[PDB]
Structure formats: structure tokens, C-alpha cells
RNA sequence: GCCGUCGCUGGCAGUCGGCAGAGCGAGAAAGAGAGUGGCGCGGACGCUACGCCGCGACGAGUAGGAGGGCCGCUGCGGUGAGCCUUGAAGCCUAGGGCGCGGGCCCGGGUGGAGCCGCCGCAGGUGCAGAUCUUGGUGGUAGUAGCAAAUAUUCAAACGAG
RNA sequence: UGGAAUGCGAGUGCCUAGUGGGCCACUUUUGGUAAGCAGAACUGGCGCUGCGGGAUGAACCGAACGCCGGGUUAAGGCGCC
RNA sequence: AGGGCGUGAAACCGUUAAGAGGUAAACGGGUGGGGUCCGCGCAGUCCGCCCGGAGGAUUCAACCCGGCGGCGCGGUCCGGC
């Protein structure tokens, strides 16, 4: 919608939105990122900190493949098995405790960020957080580790 | 010769809400009356968070409800949420509660009606409660966006707690020299 | 026995001559319509005495007497017979306007019907 | 000249890049023209299944 | 007195009518509230609630910003049982007007074939200038000028000359 | 017994154009013989601003501006223009 | 519409009609005068209720039959959705 822009509102008007003193030139202060270092230090030192340098090792030839493991809490760790499982797990007087199987559901490690409900689990994962280790065993559960 | 400066004499506050939504103009054509024919203030709030916008009404999640409710005195108490009531996965178990909202998300309404709660609408609000007695006026978090963790005091400025505008993070962008004490200075 | 309004209000009017435009009386090129000058020095557009007066928002009639005829009437714009099933309710206070794109035979349908209506035409004699 | 606050930002149009620009409105007649060339294996290859071995 | 802006986030769903009782300008936190013992068929307007109405104050403006345009141009989806050779667009007008204004509608002439109103959509959408681009036309102006190299005259003929 | 007078609804968060050549004036004051010169401090104007007066007039005095009617002044005037 | 011919604007020029003319022309506010047409004006708008005098209908209220519509806290009719 060309009628709802700016350039319908300014016709009429000298400037065009863009100063009667200082005209709307071309490139008045270089283009893109120009004077970082000399101009318009101020600007990157204020708003973009850390910019200039280098830190740390140079990794070649990174692979993200190798790089990639999910993580997934205890707050939430229910929402990757059905509610029935949950409801049979509360059921059962045995004490038959539910296997998860985060590696199934798509994570590799298991944090242990929020409440656990007091019911036991055998939770099949990759890798695993010692806070984690220690809700489970403290709610009841083992930490099966798989490859 | 007046001297009052014109700079702030215009409340800049929303008078009408900017959607074209037919729905909630009904609901502001309702509030409009109760607002102004009612004594209580209820009214008048509901009637103002009406005509906010998206950003100014967050989502209210539905553990946040359960512990606000848990919060002691307001028992038989139906909870009035402006914007919208969605689902919080991470939690268990839900007591049958009275939630008043716009709209309710179908995993959050599944959970109340299988909780055995009831989920009522403005206009049934109005019907059940004409000046809004009986209520809890409810909020998400304003501030909880991630937009407002760019905003306030600037980077690269000692004591500001502020994420830069970054386009990818790692370990070459925006880390060396406003941020170390070895290769210039730190903040 | 002309087609008398309701009320007939002293249609007070402000000002009657039109809004020139500045240098409208030297150039051909420059229009009588008016468009506000916005230069640096010029002498209209800062108020200067004994000059092109400016279109304020002071200068609008009452809102009683807005769009109003010298008759009493506010003009409405009508293309056929079926618009003045329309205007047959409205007639004291509104009237009607046959287009110019319409031909004789259908004016004089329009006449007719106005006339069975009581409804005034501004331009009843507009063909013949 | 940047302004107050906003992204760092590099793009890559220093390049004669509208030279180069692959439009894509061929788009729905190469969906037309693979649909046709896959019906036409699918008759040609009568008992055979149409996708492969 | 009139126009617009701002504020009172002021008021109006109460047009509750023989299914009736016509109000909440009044200095004073709160009900013209339910109970139980001692003839005549009658009553103006309203309210596109993005509308209507009442109070007060305010009104300059460069660069600049924002809002409203039932201001204007072109094309598209709908719509007007739209207009039109019993005259479309364009153009002219010492005519009637309307709107603060952008502009718009009628009357008269020319014209001969298409055009417009409303809700949306889209843009190659508005000129007074840029020693602006193209085309055309004035004052200058019947003016400068038809002045380098000695020179033409008479009679007759053709021929309208 | 909201712990002086008077007055006024306040606080807060984003996005952000233009500007980054100034000039003049009571008072103070640097350099200079001085300047309608150059450079400062407070405040107000011009810039951005029309109007009445100073005959004239970017800055002086009064006074700031929607469109009009009645009245009244400021600064200035009341021989004629 | 007369062979570079649909429509034929503006700048410019010619003719006719009208008005005017020593502070270059032109403009803003306010009037006055003269023309162009317009109000198809020139004994001046109608609309309800009542009174009085003159006229005309196959007519008023109330009953009978048929059809249609509205409502029914029929305190709580029967039957469907
Ligand atoms: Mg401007
Ligand atoms: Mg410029
Ligand atoms: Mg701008
Ligand atoms: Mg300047
Ligand atoms: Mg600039
Ligand atoms: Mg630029
Ligand atoms: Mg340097
Ligand atoms: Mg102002
Ligand atoms: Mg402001
Ligand atoms: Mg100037
Ligand atoms: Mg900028
Ligand atoms: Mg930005
Ligand atoms: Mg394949
Ligand atoms: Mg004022
Ligand atoms: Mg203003
Ligand atoms: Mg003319
Ligand atoms: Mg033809
Ligand atoms: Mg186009
Ligand atoms: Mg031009
Ligand atoms: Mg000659
Ligand atoms: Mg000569
Ligand atoms: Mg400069
Ligand atoms: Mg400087
Ligand atoms: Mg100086
Ligand atoms: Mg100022
Ligand atoms: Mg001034
Ligand atoms: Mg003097
Ligand atoms: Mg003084
Ligand atoms: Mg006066
Ligand atoms: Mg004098
Ligand atoms: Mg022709
Ligand atoms: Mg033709
Ligand atoms: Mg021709």
C-alpha cells in the first residue's frame, strides 16, 4: 500500500522529510559499517561491545553433527510419555515404575530443573546432570545409561 | 497571552481499541455501559484492558493460575484473565477453578473441563457478575518478553545487565574488546 | 408555490470570496486552486498585512448551515427513479439532484416521480 | 551512518547480484512438467511399481 | 456568536407505555425496596453507539513528526436490476452553487462511445521552479540586415504580369 | 493535629526525525585606538513571529495570532499629511 | 469531419461587444456603479385540530363467518428438535 507510506504525506514539502539545513545526501558518513574504529567509535562502544578482536582457539572444521546434544528437563520430562502412563504409574500398588526413553522421544541429556512427582522412574538416556541423579534418586527412579 | 505549554496537554491513552475484530467491539460496547453505569471500578479496568494491545495483554499459563489461586482467602473465587489462558505442560495436578477469558487454549480448556472446572466468557461474566463481584483480576507477565531484555540501561556500560543486538552467538561476535579486561577494557 | 424547508436558519456565511492562490493573477500556469505556500521568505504564508488571506479552520460556517442551499435544502445527487423512494421520507429537510449523464427520458421519470413524491428538484427544466 | 541501537549486520549485495537472480516462476509448470514425466514412467512401466526398486 | 483541538475516559442500551405510571441539578457515606404482628386504546425527535448530546479551557510557527481526508489520478476483486447514440469521456463557459480547503455537483455549447458512486486492494498516483527534457508560441521586430572585388542605359518580343 | 506559604494530576518504557554555520540586546567582562571587530557569563528575543508604535527597518517599546460584532487600553501620540 | 482531415485546450494573434486609462502592470480588505444571465418571482408559503353554512357516497360504532399475525407466568396443556 503505496498509499499509506510516507511519500503521500510529503508531497507538497520542500525537503521531503529530510532537512532544510543539511540536505539528504548521498553517503554522508560512509557506507555500511565505515569508521568503526575512527568515527563512529563511540557508537560501537556504547552498543555493540566486544566487536573488534579475536578470542579464543580456531576450531578448522567444526561439525554441529558432533556438536548436537539436546537437552530436556525434569520440570517437563513428563510431557514426552502419555498422561495414561502417568495414571497407571499412580494406579499400580506393585510399584511397576514407567521407562522413559528420552533417546526415543529426540534429547540426549536430562537436566533436573523443577519438581518431580513422587512416583518412581527408570529414565533411559544418554547423558545425564548430577542435579538430575540426584532429584530422581530423591523422588525414587534409576538413571539407565545408553549409547 | 496563555503560558501553558501544549506539549502535554493530549493524553496520548487509547480512547477505541485499533482492531477491527467485531467480537471485541461487542464486548467493548457492553463494558462501555457497565463502565459507566456501574459504581465499581472493575468495570472500568476490564473496559481499559480491552482496548490494549497484543503486547500490553501477555498469555497467562495455567500453573501460574493454579498457584495464584492457591494463594489463600480467595476460595469459590472466579479468576478474570483480559488476555489469553494457555496451557503449562509442567504441572500435575489441577483443581476444578472458574476462568473468565477471551480465548483459552484447547490443551488448557481440555485440562479445566477434565479437572471439572468451568470456562466462561465476558459477556457471561457480565450476566453472572454486572459489577464483577466475586472476582480475581488476573495478569501474565508484562516484562517476561524477550524484547524488554534489549531495553533499559546500555551494553558496554558498567552495572548493565543488557543483551546486545546480536544476529548469531558464538565465540567471535561481540566478546573481545568491550567485554575482556585482557584486550582493552571490560564494563 | 415552490417546495418550502422546515426550518429556514439566516444562513450566515463567514466569508464568500474564494481562496486564491498566491501569484494566481501573474502566471497562466498557476491554477485558481489553492495550495499553501511553504518557502523561507515569502509573504502569505507568515501573515504579512494586506495580503492573500490563508484557509483557516476559523473561517467554517455553522454546522446548522453546512452544505446548505440559499433555499433551505442540502443537496443530494440522484441517478434514477429508484433513489427517490429514498428521499421520499427526507423532504422537508433534504432534496434532490438529477446526474448529468442522465438522459431526458429518464429525467422526465425523475420530475414525475419527485413531483408524485413532493420531493424539490434543483434542476427540473434540465433537458426539455 | 548507524543509528542508536540495532543489529551489526553485512550484506552480501557488494556483488553485480541482479544480473544473477534465479526468479522463481517456474515453479508450478515444473511441478506440472515432473507430474507429467512421472505419469508417463508410470504408464510406460505397466505391472512395475511407479516409484522404483 | 461561529469553527476546530484537548479534557471531564462526562451523559445516552431508560424508546423500561391498560404486560404503563413518564424522575435521579441535588450541599451533606447509602432504597420513589419486598413482606410479617399490634366512558375515551392515546403519548414529537432519537441511537451510521467508529453515532448523538453537554460542559470548561485552548488556537503563532521554520526544520521536523503524527492524525484525518465523503480531496484528486490509474488499474483489480465485489457491489449500484448504476449512467449512456432520446447522447459517454474530453474541452469551453459574463450561469446556479457547496465545502475552511484539497476539490466537487448542476445549467448552456462542442463532441461522438464509452463512463462513474460505495467497501476493499495495488501503484510508474498530484509540479512553479531543478542555467529541468520534448513540442509550440511572443516582446525584441517589420528591427539588425540583403554595403568586399568601377556600371549600366534605350527599344522590341514572348507573356496575365 | 498529612507537622511552613503558594501553585499544579504524576511517575515510567520504547521507537525516533531535524539539528550539531548562528546573530542581536540591559548588566559583568577578555583582546583591540576603536569597529555594524573577534571571543565569553546570566536572561530574553530574531532565527521560527505575524500585529500597534519607532516615517523607513530580521533584534527597540508594547504585545504574541482561529473567524467576527460592541467596548477598553498598552507602547506611542492628538496643526495638516 | 474537405486528402497531415476524430476530439481541437493553453501560451500567442485577429475581429466584434462592454468597461477603463498621466504615478509600470497586477494584488488583499471594504463598498459603490454598470453589464451577463438566474430566481420562468411580481398581490405571495403551507400543514394538523375545532366551529358554521352549503353538497356528495351505498359508508360509522357494535355483532356473524373465514383467513393471517403477536403473546402466553396455560401459576406447572400435550408432542417433536
Ligand atoms: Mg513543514
Ligand atoms: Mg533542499
Ligand atoms: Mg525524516
Ligand atoms: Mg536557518
Ligand atoms: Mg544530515
Ligand atoms: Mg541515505
Ligand atoms: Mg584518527
Ligand atoms: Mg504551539
Ligand atoms: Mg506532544
Ligand atoms: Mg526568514
Ligand atoms: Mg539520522
Ligand atoms: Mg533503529
Ligand atoms: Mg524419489
Ligand atoms: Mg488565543
Ligand atoms: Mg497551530
Ligand atoms: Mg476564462
Ligand atoms: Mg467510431
Ligand atoms: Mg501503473
Ligand atoms: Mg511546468
Ligand atoms: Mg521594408
Ligand atoms: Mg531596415
Ligand atoms: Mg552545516
Ligand atoms: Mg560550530
Ligand atoms: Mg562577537
Ligand atoms: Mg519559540
Ligand atoms: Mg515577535
Ligand atoms: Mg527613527
Ligand atoms: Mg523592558
Ligand atoms: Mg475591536
Ligand atoms: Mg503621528
Ligand atoms: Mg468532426
Ligand atoms: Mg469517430
Ligand atoms: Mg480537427
Redesign the pocket.
Given at each position: 500500500?503505496?498509499?499509506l507510506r510516507?511519500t503521500?504525506?510529503?508531497?507538497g514539502?520542500?525537503?521531503?522529510?529530510?532537512?532544510?539545513?543539511?540536505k539528504?545526501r548521498k553517503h554522508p558518513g560512509g557506507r555500511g559499517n565505515a569508521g568503526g574504529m575512527h568515527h563512529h567509535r563511540i557508537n560501537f562502544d556504547k552498543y555493540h561491545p566486544g566487536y573488534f578482536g579475536k578470542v579464543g582457539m580456531r576450531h578448522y572444521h567444526l561439525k554441529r553433527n558432533q556438536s548436537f546434544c539436546p537437552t530436556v528437563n525434569l520440570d517437563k520430562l513428563w510431557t514426552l510419555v502419555s498422561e495414561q502412563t502417568r495414571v497407571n504409574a499412580a494406579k499400580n500398588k506393585t510399584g511397576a515404575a514407567p521407562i522413559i526413553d528420552v533417546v526415543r522421544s529426540g534429547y540426549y541429556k536430562v537436566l533436573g530443573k523443577g519438581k518431580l512427582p513422587k512416583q518412581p522412574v527408570i529414565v533411559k538416556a544418554k547423558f545425564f546432570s548430577r542435579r538430575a541423579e540426584e532429584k530422581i534418586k530423591g523422588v525414587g527412579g534409576a538413571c539407565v545409561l545408553v549409547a | 497571552?496563555?503560558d501553558?505549554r501544549?506539549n502535554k496537554?493530549?493524553?496520548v491513552?487509547r480512547?477505541?481499541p485499533k482492531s477491527?475484530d467485531i467480537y471485541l467491539?461487542l464486548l467493548?460496547?457492553l463494558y462501555?455501559?457497565l463502565?459507566?453505569?456501574t459504581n465499581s471500578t472493575f468495570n472500568?479496568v476490564v473496559?481499559?484492558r480491552l482496548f490494549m494491545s497484543r503486547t500490553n495483554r501477555p498469555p497467562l499459563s495455567l500453573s501460574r493460575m493454579i498457584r495464584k489461586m492457591k494463594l489463600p482467602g480467595r476460595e469459590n473465587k472466579t479468576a478474570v484473565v483480559v488476555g489469553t489462558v494457555t496451557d503449562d505442560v509442567r504441572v500435575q495436578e489441577v483443581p476444578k477453578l472458574k476462568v473468565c477469558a477471551l480465548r483459552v487454549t484447547s490443551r488448557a480448556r481440555s485440562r479445566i473441563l477434565k479437572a471439572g472446572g468451568k470456562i466462561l466468557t465476558f459477556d457471561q461474566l457480565a450476566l453472572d457478575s454486572p459489577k464483577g463481584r466475586g472476582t480475581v483480576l488476573l495478569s501474565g507477565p508484562r516484562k517476561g518478553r524477550e524484547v524488554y531484555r534489549?531495553?533499559?540501561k546500555a551494553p558496554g556500560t558498567p552495572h548493565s545487565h543488557t543483551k546486545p543486538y546480536v544476529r548469531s552467538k558464538g565465540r567471535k561476535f561481540e566478546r573481545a574488546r568491550g567485554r575482556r579486561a585482557s584486550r582493552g577494557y571490560k564494563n | 408555490?415552490?417546495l418550502?424547508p422546515l426550518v429556514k436558519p439566516k444562513?450566515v456565511?463567514?466569508?464568500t470570496?474564494?481562496?486564491?492562490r498566491?501569484?494566481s493573477?501573474?502566471?497562466?500556469?498557476?491554477?485558481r486552486?489553492?495550495?499553501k505556500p511553504?518557502?523561507?521568505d515569502n509573504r502569505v504564508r507568515?501573515?504579512?498585512?494586506?495580503?492573500?488571506?490563508m484557509?483557516?479552520?476559523?473561517?467554517?460556517?455553522?454546522?446548522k448551515?453546512?452544505?446548505?442551499?440559499?433555499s433551505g435544502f442540502r443537496?443530494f445527487?440522484v441517478?434514477?427513479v429508484?433513489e427517490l423512494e429514498v428521499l421520499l421520507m427526507c423532504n422537508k429537510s433534504y432534496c434532490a439532484?438529477?446526474?448529468?449523464?442522465?438522459?431526458?427520458?429518464?429525467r422526465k421519470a425523475i420530475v414525475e416521480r419527485a413531483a408524485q413524491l413532493a420531493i424539490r428538484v434543483?434542476?427540473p427544466?434540465?433537458?426539455? | 551512518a548507524p543509528?542508536?541501537?540495532?543489529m551489526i549486520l553485512k550484506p552480501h549485495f557488494h556483488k553485480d547480484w541482479q544480473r544473477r537472480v534465479a526468479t522463481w516462476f517456474n515453479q508450478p509448470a515444473r511441478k506440472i512438467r515432473r507430474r507429467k514425466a512421472r505419469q508417463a514412467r508410470a504408464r510406460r512401466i505397466a505391472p512395475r511399481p511407479a516409484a522404483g526398486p
Open positions: 500500500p503505496s498509499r510516507k503521500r504525506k510529503l508531497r514539502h520542500v525537503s521531503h522529510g529530510h532537512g532544510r539545513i543539511g539528504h | 497571552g496563555v501553558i501544549h496537554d493530549r493524553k491513552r480512547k477505541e477491527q467491539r467493548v460496547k462501555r455501559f463502565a459507566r453505569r472500568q473496559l481499559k534489549h531495553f533499559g | 408555490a415552490a418550502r444562513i456565511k463567514k466569508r470570496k474564494k481562496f486564491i498566491h501569484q493573477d501573474r502566471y497562466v500556469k498557476i491554477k486552486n489553492w495550495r511553504r518557502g523561507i507568515r501573515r504579512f498585512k494586506g495580503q492573500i488571506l484557509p483557516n479552520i476559523g473561517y467554517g460556517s455553522n454546522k448551515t453546512k452544505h446548505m442551499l440559499p443537496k445527487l441517478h434514477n429508484k439532484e438529477i446526474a448529468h449523464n442522465v438522459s431526458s427520458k429518464n434543483t434542476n427544466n434540465a433537458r426539455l | 543509528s542508536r541501537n540495532g
